[PDB]
Amino acid sequence: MLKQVEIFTDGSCLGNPGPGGYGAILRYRGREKTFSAGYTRTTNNRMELMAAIVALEALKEHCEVILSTDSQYVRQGITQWIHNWKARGWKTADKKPVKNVDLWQRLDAALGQHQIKWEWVKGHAGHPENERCAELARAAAMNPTLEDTGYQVEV
């Protein structure tokens, strides 16, 4: 509905897989809600999905949200894969579970509850908020306190 909100999100990881973190800022009429956490072993992709997911789920009513992120991964999937998955039953052409299906589905459910406008940022053109989120993410990744139970260990 109405009620405007601005969300900034970033994800960080030290390896692949390695300790990682996310950072997100929920802003409404000047007020800011900050989010972040570190995980002992995760991926950059998953943190980037986790940042968007946490912020959105923090919303308790239909909102017009402008989602700002530097993630190429999140971008490709919102504009290139999400549609095919939905029509293919969250399965890859050759019928087979997509990577991070747990987070993509949960993020898609998150997006459904609001009218979203994506603001993709490239290189040095992101706002000051996109960098606070990066500091939060990198800080969390250096002091992880949680396990990413949904990550299928690939190594």
Q: Which residues bind Mn ion (CB under 5 A)?
A: 10, 70, 134
Which is closer to Mn ion, CB of 63 or CB of 133? 133
Which is closer to Mn ion, CB of 22 or CB of 104? 22
Beta strands in the chain (DSSP E): 4-13, 18-28, 31-42, 64-69, 115-120
Question: Which residues neighbour 77 within 8 Å (Cβ) at sequence distance 6 or greater?
Answer: 104
Do the beta carbons of residue 149 and residue 103 sit within 8 Å?
A: no
Tokens of 27: 């802003």
Minimal CB distance residue for Mn ion: 10
CB of residue 10 vs Mn ion: minimum separation in angstroms?
4
Do the beta carbons of residue 107 and residue 47 sit within 8 Å?
A: no
CB of residue 56 vs Mn ion: minimum separation in angstroms?
18
Which is closer to Mn ion, CB of 52 or CB of 63? 52
Which is closer to Mn ion, CB of 6 or CB of 10? 10
CB of residue 70 vs Mn ion: minimum separation in angstroms?
5
One-letter identity of residue 122? K
CB of residue 85 vs Mn ion: minimum separation in angstroms?
24
Beta bridge partners of 39: 20, 146
